[PDB]
Design a protein around this ligand. Structure first.
Ligand SMILES: CC(=O)N[C@H]1[C@H]([C@H](O)[C@H](O)CO)O[C@@](O[C@H]2[C@@H](O)[C@@H](CO)O[C@@H](O[C@H]3[C@H](O)[C@@H](O)[C@@H](O)O[C@@H]3CO)[C@@H]2O)(C(=O)O)C[C@@H]1O
Length: 278
């Protein structure tokens, strides 16, 4: 209701392909002190008809103080399922919906709060809409089931200054530690990002010619077992700017010339749900 900008509401988007197991839909926005409610719908339709079926309807109610889930099909609504609404009028919201074969897992502020079993085909979801008292500031749909240990190459130029590698993951509930390596062609690790819960610290280092370097820790681990996190590795001219959940966690001065960072590896006790180059 403030600055239209991107994603103005009523917002609607036709998916390029049907929503599939794995795959997450992320919605972030701002609310006003007078916001009453907003909705997020996964639905069916041709491309302008609208309605039809709504496999998953999410209603965030500030008046009722609840988040409500339901399904509409064959012209009828089923029985609503509710959870408490942790948000107060005003303040930002972060809701994420990941599809699985037997249900949708919905997280609020990166915390799992609802498991909604499919009532109608997940495949009938061809669009998603957002409407109501919310100023959308971020939307993204994609990802998949990333096996871990994970391993792959990066684009053509890969990670170069001016670019950033965005990773969505959730440290495992009973995990001790995990790591992410940004590698160069010859196999050297430009950056080793290694959160260690058993040591309450995130270790950063580089692997050059089979040798581990100095090693930088300290900064207070901002991650939490079982809680989702948004990791951003901003490659800059003099260093990597490491962002955790929107806040700069650390800076890591380059030990290997940046440029040509074309490899990625992820291992340890962690679940990866999204990887993207921005
Ligand atoms: C007293 C001592 O020698 N400490 C050495 C430690 C310990 O052997 C280690 O912490 C025991 O778990 O190892 C040191 O080098 C480690 C460090 O580079 C970390 C950084 O993540 O990597 C360790 O190897 C990891 C590997 O990277 C993972 O992929 C996986 O294989 O786990 C192994 C460890 O089992 C290095 O051993 C260290 O500083 O911690 C060197 C210390 O001298």
């Amino acid at each position: 209701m403030a600055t239209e900008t991107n994603y103005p509401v009523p917002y609607r988007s036709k998916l390029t392909e049907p929503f599939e197991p794995g795959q997450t839909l992320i919605i972030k926005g701002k609310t006003a002190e007078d916001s009453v409610r907003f909705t997020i719908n996964l639905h069916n339709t041709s491309a302008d008809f609208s309605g039809n079926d709504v496999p998953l309807h999410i209603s965030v109610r500030f008046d009722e103080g609840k988040i409500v889930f339901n399904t509409f099909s064959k012209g009828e609504w089923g029985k609503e399922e509710r959870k408490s609404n942790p948000y107060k009028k005003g303040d930002d919201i972060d809701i994420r919906i990941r599809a699985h074969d037997s249900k949708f897992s919905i997280s609020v502020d990166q915390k799992e709060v609802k498991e909604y079993e499919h009532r109608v085909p997940l495949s009938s979801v061809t669009h998603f809409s957002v409407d109501g008292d919310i100023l959308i500031t971020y939307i993204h749909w994609g990802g998949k089931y990333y096996p871990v240990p994970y391993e792959s190459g990066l684009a053509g130029d890969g990670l170069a200054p001016g670019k950033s590698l965005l990773i969505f993951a959730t440290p495992e509930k009973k995990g001790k530690r995990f790591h992410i390596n940004l590698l160069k062609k010859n196999g050297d690790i430009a950056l080793h990002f290694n959160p260690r819960f058993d040591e309450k610290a995130i270790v950063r280092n580089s692997l050059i010619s089979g040798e581990w370097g100095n090693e930088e820790r300290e900064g207070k681990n901002p991650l939490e077992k079982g809680i989702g996190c948004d990791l951003e590795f901003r490659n800059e001219e003099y260093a990597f700017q490491i962002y955790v959940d929107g806040e700069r966690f650390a800076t890591y001065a380059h030990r290997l010339d940046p440029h040509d960072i074309n490899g990625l590896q992820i291992g340890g006790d962690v679940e990866v749900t999204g990887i993207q180059m921005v």
